[PDB]
Structure 1
């Protein structure tokens, strides 16, 4: 029903704009922006649903880890605050676990807010801008999201349409509406008052809709609709963006499920054993609560958030400004990099340009027409046009036949560039006249598309007829030049369109071929170093380009790329999906493709069990970028690429992409390392508790003691994001896993339980009796009894920390530590400082308040030996695990 406003804008004219038409200095636009924002709408991106925080927090607080923390608080409530004996009502754990629940839920909500699906500027690090002219200063580039009905945006070459907009000024405006309607050939728009309600909305020669990227031209226009009211909004309503890529959410939930399984197995066993043997069911509940607290690694979401933030910040610092947080996982799993040859593999700066006649000799007339075609072009200026302009300007002082053409001629019409036609045209004319007949129609483009258009040739000394022998001769010379490494463009010229109009493809015919211009794009100085690094790291660099095969093969061979059976688009059309997948999985250089052929190639490669990353900086490559699993682009590019991309790069270089991939991999490597280490250590400690529940007459450690141990360990594990990772782990694309975590827990876990039992006995027979006498003689309620219990708890507290935090330097690498794989300095410093903090805790007022005590100095050397023994046993079990289950982590 929104079509009423659109049809009203299409009909009438600028003279009937109740919502203001004149603006940018007089339009009453300083507070009407709020009226338009509320009454009309705002530029939103609402896809299928925007459930408010009322449901967002509801679904974020039912996370399995949050459920575990809540049930820990509930059991702590149901045991330590209500069902305890009278006088034994000490909450402590209730509040200290509710705080953990809240700190997990808030961080999970923050993550899910900035976690989305593929291309989404949720982080808002880098964005896309529109040249708006508001009534304060004007000419202020603003984000596309900050656009309201009743504003003017100037549309230029490459500028994506901000919102549903009505054209006000039009100068050779051509926009590609293929992103929403098809028909990749650019559609011409004009400013008029025609009504013509009978239309499929697509044409709308007066209306420019959202997503219709401007191929060429300069045009001002007023906004008539914004937000989901735009046709882009109804297209986004059909979300169809759900994917089955295992991400951080599923991995964290699976780790929580492994913890749930281990708890559901162990806690009932401990409860049954204690209740049936000791006859103290409340003590059994305390044992179960301690086991559940120890097994569950609280302060895990904080570590996950730290890892994600560190990865995002580091990737941004490595000239790789990422988008929605799931970009890290998507890019880190890239098997195939499908890029182009322009810019990525070649320094686009053309240093070898040639203006050649039909024979192959120099002739400045061709350069003159090329300069006329380039300097009077409203479209995107590529390297060829810039090289032509610079060379002509540098040589103008020598031969003034090129004498300044910027003022002696004035543009009067233009034909844009279509991939179908491969030729761009301009009709230029002298402004001062002097001949009353000068309307040249210079056209520059490809080889065969230009030859099939021209009907006569030039040079020699005459306008010779286009003999097929001449056509074959020109084509063969062009092929020779292309195989020499230089790309060539052919120019044509027609004259005397006395009515300066009717310029269609029909008028772009029957021309005189002046000659061809040759340019060389030298290969980049990164001589396959980036290519070899990507191959080492698990990325197959495939080239998707539409240029001639000869130049592409020359460049690829110069950059050490495989010059081999190169599939052309003509073959791709004949090759069905199965054989196209076969050749794509085999070939690595694809030349002379179409914007849709690249999309088909990417789709088939992805569907053949792979992940594809397309890097593009043009209007047409977005068709394949949206078809790619991870979208990559440069900052100096068109908006249709950046909006559809995910890995926007501050510089164009494959090494930047490689470093971004490495940092993204390191994020998950450190995350899974921390998860495995914490889970295995917790399993070992609680398994020692379970196996010693039948002997010790007291709980080995209080629930508050284990909780503080875990909190200190986790807050000292915040340097895991800044931890060095072995190259052997960073050279293979990897995804989230939980089975390896479970194997690590069940294998490298009990090796700590054995020495936990050793420390149990050494406390119950060597130190606590040394300070209080034999425990059997100790009477319950005495100072000696409570002192014995507190000293045992403190001893296991200190020993457990010293073993859990110092084993990180060993289990981090599957190799010999400190000999082949050193740790990170922040990790070591944080480990040492946390260990000192825990060792100093029981000697202060915090001890004897939680239940700790000062320890005898004889207790320290036993720990010095126990830690080393644990290191050795861990190394043995680590080599066993590596050689048995393939990899350690």
Structure 2
């Protein structure tokens, strides 16, 4: 906590050695404080940290199901080599799921190029070697004498000891392209925010002209710019989506490790050899886990990103749009993001508070014949002249009458620009008037004549009070005022002096605000409509960010200043930030801290900005956006970088992202319930069946071929009501839903059991308990049961989706199954309904007797209606289906 509090000790005296730094003292300084360097790095072993997640309940199944092959190996040959139709499928599934979990994050890693910039060298500095020279950056240290000249860049913060009308553009840290004066004088003892610390310089700021001497007092981590450079590394926190998917996988694992040992114990103690029990438990381990869930998740995310890639928005990280959908609080930079860093006239009125055409027309003249020096405020005046709709050409023709005799341009030493022009009225060369505008200070000091009530009077103390009150109403919004005044004079044979420019008749006041973008208000309203709070994080002065956001409609209440959050501890910081609004005067570390605390409270926080100072906040957020005017480094740190300028597209994301999550939270439940029910019946009927109902490979086929319809699940129609609230990744609701709707299938999977064990299978192959257990029709009976339960389970688990996807009254009310999904479903049922081919060496073909299908349709219909009842109960119990 080494701060720069040595006031009046570091002024007028270097407080250290003047360039004669002792070697021992140099070593002491570099030990206790260190040098000025910025460290960065990359990684290429992302595979190690991206495999482990939901891959493990696949490599565990692989290890168990290959140890099964090893167990039947070394003893048997055909049973020990007929397994690989397992191991191979499970291994390629492991590889696919791992590669997909890799690509879901690879876009962020390979699209982040925040390293090309900085590491600046070749600094024009005064050194003891040869005076003013180009020196490498590693030769400037704490206590070194550094000079800022015309065109050189400051490499480290400085305690400036000499200044001469020095102006610096601090858009790198404050986001404001307008230059601000920087002086060598000691500031206030209590000081202010770091950006307003005139006595100290900032790394990364650009100087165009002027020279200044200073001494480096801070380097390393104490540099604010060093801070944002060091903060932007591969500290990519796990967003909401990753944690949600991990929690869902852990719910599945918590179910698997409770169900598997139970069925293992039952089938080991009850009837069979422990090899049969191991196979039986492997069946329940395979069935519970939806094998192609990562593929469906990736395809949903890809659909979202592709859709958002047509609204003209680069999506950098593929996992950004779901986070955009689940966005709860949007923290937004002010300078250049919602405003447009463009000075435009908004208040230009007489001393009574109404627009004066004459004064603005005079300003238009002084700015349109302004050939000496062009300045952004002059462009503001001229553009407002045309926005005013009062025609220019008369004034354009007034060049022939109100002829420009001469001009003293906007010289910065006196902050006065004075155009001396003659009023050729009606053809005669009349008197000459000069109009000077400049900063309010000198104008107020020199002005004693005022145009009031239509005449010219002296500047009385009451008129001074009135003018000061107008200045105060203009300043309280954080807007600077430039005074304009005309003076009449006879034809000047001699030149004009500064002392003659006094007692000049002032017209009024000017206000060049940075107006918010025309779509900002509509974007804020749309964001508030979809349950997304909006907060403002800007380094600008509090007054201007009350003025703005008192114009966009956002409730501005007790704007928190930077010092308050700096002195505030983390818990009450989180308490304040959530229940508050626009913040002011923040450093990049402050923005990152605020976003992080908002994250820790349980809110998925997105961020938007354009400046380099916003990079830390962009990277610390769940989803970092960037408007078109964003700087290149901010673009690289972004995730959903925009292109046009319109913020309306934000809602087109927030809508679309939500309709992705629903389509992903549908399947995740809609396939975890069924897969539970299918695996429930292989548990509570795992003791009465003298053989496993459906083998491991058959269940792998069922969970694979059915999961290719969920490839078309992302195109299903989410109705209109899920898309109004940012939904949280509630995995516990999954563990309830699949315990409520899942078992309703299991009973019918028992009805299919008894049926197919008593009337269908014994019909063709004779009654059971009368067949030789070795082989004869025992193989045929077992295969017929296998294929029949295959067909029935597939039908009944992929046709109930039309009943589960939507809340009450499907079809008629909510026209379900948008044609892509329903087409794929009926195109994949027609695939699984064919175990009649040469692909019946899957250890069951047993072409089903026609007698079975009437009993299959009767099961499907009655299961669909029972699921309707249980869906009603579930909706009426907790809050809804998902």
Asked whether the two chains share a fold, i.e. TM above 0.5, the reply is yes
Asked if 1 retains the 8 angstrom alpha-carbon contact of 2:373 and 2:409, the reply is no
Give the whole-Å Cα distance in 2 for the aligned partners of 1:135 and 1:833.
84
Give the whole-Å Cα distance in 1 for the aligned partners of 2:734 and 2:474.
59
Asked if 1 retains the 8 angstrom alpha-carbon contact of 2:336 and 2:610, the reply is no
1:610-663 CA-partner distances (Å, limit 9, x unpaired):
565555557887797778765444224555654554443344555422221122
Query: Alignment partner of 2:512: what SS?
Result: strand
1:720-762 CA-partner distances (Å, limit 9, x unpaired):
2222224443322223232222222222221111100100111
Asked if 2 retains the 8 angstrom alpha-carbon contact of 1:82 and 1:89, the reply is no
Query: Alignment partner of 1:514: what SS?
Result: strand
Asked if 2 retains the 8 angstrom alpha-carbon contact of 1:330 and 1:630, the reply is yes
Query: Alignment partner of 1:139: what SS?
Result: strand
Question: Which range moved further: 278-287 or 333-342?
Answer: 333-342
Question: Which range moved further: 406-415 or 357-366?
Answer: 406-415
Residues 715, 351 of structure 1: CA spacing in aligned structure 2 closer, same or farther, 3 A cutoff?
same
Asked if 2 retains the 8 angstrom alpha-carbon contact of 1:384 and 1:519, the reply is yes
Give the whole-Å Cα distance in 2 for the aligned partners of 1:448 and 1:19.
28
Question: Which range moved further: 839-848 or 570-579?
Answer: 570-579
Partner residue of 2:270 out of 264, 277, 302? 277
The residue that corresponds to 1:299 in the other structure is: 292
1:837-886 CA-partner distances (Å, limit 9, x unpaired):
43443122212445223212222222212112111222222222233333
Asked if 1 retains the 8 angstrom alpha-carbon contact of 2:162 and 2:213, the reply is yes
Give the whole-Å Cα distance in 2 for the aligned partners of 1:726 and 1:157.
63
Please say if 1:618 is aligned against 2:611. yes
Query: Alignment partner of 2:624: what SS?
Result: strand
Displacement of 1:517 in angstroms is 4.8
Residues 210, 472 of structure 1: CA spacing in aligned structure 2 closer, same or farther, 3 A cutoff?
closer
Displacement of 1:709 in angstroms is 0.8
Query: Alignment partner of 2:123: what SS?
Result: strand
Displacement of 1:571 in angstroms is 11
Question: Which range moved further: 227-236 or 782-791?
Answer: 227-236
Asked if 1 retains the 8 angstrom alpha-carbon contact of 2:240 and 2:729, the reply is yes
Q: Which has the larger radius of gyration?
A: 2
Residues 239, 723 of structure 1: CA spacing in aligned structure 2 closer, same or farther, 3 A cutoff?
same
Question: Which range moved further: 549-558 or 294-303?
Answer: 549-558
Residues 777, 171 of structure 1: CA spacing in aligned structure 2 closer, same or farther, 3 A cutoff?
farther
Give the whole-Å Cα distance in 2 for the aligned partners of 1:632 and 1:129.
34
Residues 43, 199 of structure 1: CA spacing in aligned structure 2 closer, same or farther, 3 A cutoff?
same
Give the whole-Å Cα distance in 2 for the aligned partners of 1:208 and 1:769.
92
Asked if 2 retains the 8 angstrom alpha-carbon contact of 1:478 and 1:488, the reply is yes
Displacement of 1:385 in angstroms is 6.8
Displacement of 1:832 in angstroms is 2.6
Residues 94, 879 of structure 1: CA spacing in aligned structure 2 closer, same or farther, 3 A cutoff?
same
Asked if 1 retains the 8 angstrom alpha-carbon contact of 2:175 and 2:611, the reply is no
Give the whole-Å Cα distance in 2 for the aligned partners of 1:555 and 1:562.
11
Unaligned runs of 5+ in 2: none
Asked if 2 retains the 8 angstrom alpha-carbon contact of 1:356 and 1:518, the reply is no
Partner residue of 2:180 out of 179, 183, 187? 187
Give the whole-Å Cα distance in 2 for the aligned partners of 1:839 and 1:734.
35
Residues 283, 761 of structure 1: CA spacing in aligned structure 2 closer, same or farther, 3 A cutoff?
same
1:348-394 CA-partner distances (Å, limit 9, x unpaired):
99999786555667767754675589789999999987664345469
Question: Which range moved further: 727-736 or 548-557?
Answer: 548-557
The residue that corresponds to 2:156 in the other structure is: 163
Residues 50, 751 of structure 1: CA spacing in aligned structure 2 closer, same or farther, 3 A cutoff?
same
Question: Which range moved further: 820-829 or 754-763?
Answer: 820-829
Residues 782, 596 of structure 1: CA spacing in aligned structure 2 closer, same or farther, 3 A cutoff?
closer
The residue that corresponds to 2:655 in the other structure is: 662
Give the whole-Å Cα distance in 2 for the aligned partners of 1:646 and 1:145.
34
1:463-522 CA-partner distances (Å, limit 9, x unpaired):
977655334434656789999999997657999999999999999999985534578999
Asked if 2 retains the 8 angstrom alpha-carbon contact of 1:684 and 1:749, the reply is yes
Give the whole-Å Cα distance in 2 for the aligned partners of 1:206 and 1:74.
72
TM-score normalised over the length of structure 1: 0.68
Query: Alignment partner of 1:878: what SS?
Result: helix
TM-score normalised over the length of structure 2: 0.68
Question: Which range moved further: 547-556 or 391-400?
Answer: 547-556
The residue that corresponds to 1:3 in the other structure is: none
1:325-363 CA-partner distances (Å, limit 9, x unpaired):
453354334334455899999999999978655566776
Give the whole-Å Cα distance in 2 for the aligned partners of 1:458 and 1:401.
24
Displacement of 1:666 in angstroms is 2.4
Asked if 2 retains the 8 angstrom alpha-carbon contact of 1:297 and 1:682, the reply is yes
1:3-34 CA-partner distances (Å, limit 9, x unpaired):
xxxxx999999999999999999999999999
Give the whole-Å Cα distance in 1 for the aligned partners of 2:245 and 2:487.
67
Asked if 2 retains the 8 angstrom alpha-carbon contact of 1:486 and 1:521, the reply is no
Asked if 1 retains the 8 angstrom alpha-carbon contact of 2:345 and 2:384, the reply is no
Give the whole-Å Cα distance in 2 for the aligned partners of 1:351 and 1:726.
45
Query: Alignment partner of 1:775: what SS?
Result: coil
Question: Which range moved further: 840-849 or 387-396?
Answer: 387-396
Asked if 2 retains the 8 angstrom alpha-carbon contact of 1:625 and 1:631, the reply is yes
Asked if 2 retains the 8 angstrom alpha-carbon contact of 1:410 and 1:428, the reply is yes
Residues 444, 293 of structure 1: CA spacing in aligned structure 2 closer, same or farther, 3 A cutoff?
farther
Displacement of 1:294 in angstroms is 0.9
What is the Cα-based RMSD across aligned positions, in Å? 10.9
1:376-421 CA-partner distances (Å, limit 9, x unpaired):
9999999987664345469999666854999999999999999999
Residues 223, 447 of structure 1: CA spacing in aligned structure 2 closer, same or farther, 3 A cutoff?
closer
Displacement of 1:307 in angstroms is 1.6
Give the whole-Å Cα distance in 2 for the aligned partners of 1:755 and 1:136.
92
Question: Which range moved further: 92-101 or 40-49?
Answer: 40-49
Displacement of 1:797 in angstroms is 0.7
Asked if 2 retains the 8 angstrom alpha-carbon contact of 1:48 and 1:239, the reply is no
Give the whole-Å Cα distance in 2 for the aligned partners of 1:567 and 1:197.
19
Asked if 1 retains the 8 angstrom alpha-carbon contact of 2:681 and 2:750, the reply is yes
Displacement of 1:693 in angstroms is 1.7
Residues 394, 199 of structure 1: CA spacing in aligned structure 2 closer, same or farther, 3 A cutoff?
closer
Asked if 1 retains the 8 angstrom alpha-carbon contact of 2:221 and 2:227, the reply is yes
Partner residue of 1:585 out of 555, 573, 578? 578
Displacement of 1:74 in angstroms is 4.6
Residues 814, 334 of structure 1: CA spacing in aligned structure 2 closer, same or farther, 3 A cutoff?
same
Give the whole-Å Cα distance in 2 for the aligned partners of 1:140 and 1:607.
50
Give the whole-Å Cα distance in 1 for the aligned partners of 2:101 and 2:543.
53
1:766-814 CA-partner distances (Å, limit 9, x unpaired):
2222222222333346553322222211111111111111122122123
Give the whole-Å Cα distance in 2 for the aligned partners of 1:489 and 1:376.
19
Displacement of 1:293 in angstroms is 1.2
Question: Which range moved further: 79-88 or 489-498?
Answer: 489-498
Asked if 2 retains the 8 angstrom alpha-carbon contact of 1:447 and 1:475, the reply is no
Asked if 2 retains the 8 angstrom alpha-carbon contact of 1:118 and 1:646, the reply is no
Residues 235, 660 of structure 1: CA spacing in aligned structure 2 closer, same or farther, 3 A cutoff?
closer
Asked if 1 retains the 8 angstrom alpha-carbon contact of 2:107 and 2:318, the reply is yes
Residues 662, 447 of structure 1: CA spacing in aligned structure 2 closer, same or farther, 3 A cutoff?
farther
Asked if 2 retains the 8 angstrom alpha-carbon contact of 1:161 and 1:213, the reply is yes
Displacement of 1:601 in angstroms is 8.5
Please say if 1:444 is aligned against 2:431. no
Query: Alignment partner of 1:721: what SS?
Result: helix
Displacement of 1:712 in angstroms is 0.8
1:86-138 CA-partner distances (Å, limit 9, x unpaired):
77544211211111111112112222323569998999999999999999999
Residues 341, 101 of structure 1: CA spacing in aligned structure 2 closer, same or farther, 3 A cutoff?
closer
Give the whole-Å Cα distance in 2 for the aligned partners of 1:81 and 1:168.
86
Displacement of 1:706 in angstroms is 0.7
| Matching of residues 425-824 of structure 1 within 5 Å | 468-474=461-467, 514-517=507-510, 533-541=526-534, 610=603, 613=606, 615-616=608-609, 630-639=623-632, 642-643=635-636, 645-653=638-646, 655-780=648-773, 784-824=777-817
Asked if 1 retains the 8 angstrom alpha-carbon contact of 2:153 and 2:206, the reply is yes
Displacement of 1:85 in angstroms is 6.6
Asked if 1 retains the 8 angstrom alpha-carbon contact of 2:159 and 2:199, the reply is yes
Residues 11, 727 of structure 1: CA spacing in aligned structure 2 closer, same or farther, 3 A cutoff?
closer
Question: Which range moved further: 515-524 or 663-672?
Answer: 515-524
Residues 868, 60 of structure 1: CA spacing in aligned structure 2 closer, same or farther, 3 A cutoff?
closer
Query: Alignment partner of 2:729: what SS?
Result: coil
Give the whole-Å Cα distance in 2 for the aligned partners of 1:532 and 1:863.
53
Give the whole-Å Cα distance in 2 for the aligned partners of 1:396 and 1:358.
22
Question: Which range moved further: 682-691 or 88-97?
Answer: 88-97
